[PDB]
Amino acid sequence: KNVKSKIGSTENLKHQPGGGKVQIVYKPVDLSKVTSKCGSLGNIHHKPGGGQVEVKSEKLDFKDRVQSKIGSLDNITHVPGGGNKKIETHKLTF
Amino acid sequence: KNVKSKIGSTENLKHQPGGGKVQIVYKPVDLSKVTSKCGSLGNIHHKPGGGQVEVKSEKLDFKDRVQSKIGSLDNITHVPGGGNKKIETHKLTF
Amino acid sequence: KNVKSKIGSTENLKHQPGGGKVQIVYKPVDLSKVTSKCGSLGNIHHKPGGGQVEVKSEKLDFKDRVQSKIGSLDNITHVPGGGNKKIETHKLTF
Numbered sequence: 677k678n679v680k681s682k683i684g685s686t687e688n689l690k691h692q693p694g695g696g697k698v699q700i701v702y703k704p705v706d707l708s709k710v711t712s713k714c715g716s717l718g719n720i721h722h723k724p725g726g727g728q729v730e731v732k733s734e735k736l737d738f739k740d741r742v743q744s745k746i747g748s749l750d751n752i753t754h755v756p757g758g759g760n761k762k763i764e765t766h767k768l769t770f
Numbered sequence: 771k772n773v774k775s776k777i778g779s780t781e782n783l784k785h786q787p788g789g790g791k792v793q794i795v796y797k798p799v800d801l802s803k804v805t806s807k808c809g810s811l812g813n814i815h816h817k818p819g820g821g822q823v824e825v826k827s828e829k830l831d832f833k834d835r836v837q838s839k840i841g842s843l844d845n846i847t848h849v850p851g852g853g854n855k856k857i858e859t860h861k862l863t864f
Numbered sequence: 865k866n867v868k869s870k871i872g873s874t875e876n877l878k879h880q881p882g883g884g885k886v887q888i889v890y891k892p893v894d895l896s897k898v899t900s901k902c903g904s905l906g907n908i909h910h911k912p913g914g915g916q917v918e919v920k921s922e923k924l925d926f927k928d929r930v931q932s933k934i935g936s937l938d939n940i941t942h943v944p945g946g947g948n949k950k951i952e953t954h955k956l957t958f
Contacts (some may be wrong), residue, residue: 679850682779682873684843687855688831696789696883702796708816709803718813718907725820727796727890727912732825736788736882738832739837744780747842747936755858756773758851758945765859767845772866773944776873778937783877790883796890802910803897811900812907819914821890827921830882834928838874841936847953852868854944859953861939 679756686744693738698731773850780838787832792825867944874932881926886919 706724710717751767800818804811845861894912898905939955 678774680772680774681848681850682776683842683846684777685779686838687779687781687783689781691784691789692786692789693784694788696786696880697791698789699793700796701794702855704797705799707799707801709801710814711803711805712811713805713807715806715809715811717811717850720814720816722802722814722816724816724818727798727820727914728824729794729796730824730826731789731792731794733789733827733882734829735848736827736830736832738787738830739782739835740782740834742782742836744782744838746778746840751844751859751861752846752848753857754846754848754944755854755857756850758853760851760854761856763854763857767861769863772868774866774868775942775944776870777942778871778934779873780932781875781877783875784881785879786883787878787881788883790880791885792883793887794890794905795888798890798892798894800894802894804908805897805899805907806900807899809900809903809905811905814910816908816910818894818912821892821914821917823888823890823917825883825886825888825919827883828923830880830921830924830926832924832926834876834878834930836874836876836930838932840872840934844935844938845938845953845955846940846942847951848942849941849948849951850918850944851948853947854945854951855949857948857951861955863957864886 684746687741778840782836872934920940
């Protein structure tokens with residue numbers, strides 16, 4: 677049970693600005709089997725080449741301007757609680 | 771049970787600006803089997819070449835301007851709670 | 865049960881601006897089997913070439929301007945809660 681509220685707020689939220697989220701799972705399985713029964717065999721050169729995984733962010737020029745003008749917040753009643761009674765907010769001028 | 775509210779707010783939300791979300795799963799399976807029974811065999815050169823996975827973000831020029839003007843927020847009653855009674859907000863001028 | 869509300873708000877939401885979402889699943893299966901029974905065989909050159917997967921974002925010039933003018937938010941009653949009673953919001957001038 678989440679209650680979230682924003683009244684006249686400025687937010688500049690940034691999750692992982694440059695690189696971001698990089699998830700690399702390098703899990704090859706190698707079960708290359710050689711069976712020789714009642715015979716003859718030469719040399720075994722087993723040279724399986726490794727993978728190359730590269731993730732690059734070269735030149736990034738990010739510019740963000742965030743402006744907020746509120747004249748006045750004045751007269752706010754904000755009740756996110758429960759079972760509350762008799763909540764009053766008065767404002768008079770002159 | 772989520773209750774979200776935004777009254778006169780400015781937001782500049784950015785999730786993974788540069789790189790983003792990169793998920794690489796490099797999991798090849800190699801079961802190349804050689805069976806020799808009651809015979810003869812020469813050399814075995816086993817050279818399976820690795821994969822190449824590259825993800826690149828070269829030159830990125832991102833510019834964001836966010837402006838917000840509110841004259842006045844004034845007279846707000848905001849009740850996201852439950853079972854509340856008798857909530858009043860008065861504003862008079864002159 | 866989600867309740868979302870936006871009254872006079874400015875939002876500049878961006879999910880993965882540059883790279884985006886890149887999902888590469890490199891999982892080849894290699895079951896090339898050689899069986900020799902009661903015979904003769906020469907050399908075995910097993911050279912399966914690896915794949916090349918490349919994802920590129922070269923030159924990206926993104927520019928976003930977001931302007932918002934609200935004169936006044938004034939007199940708002942916002943009740944997303946349940947079972948609430950007697951919620952009043954008064955505004956008088958002169």
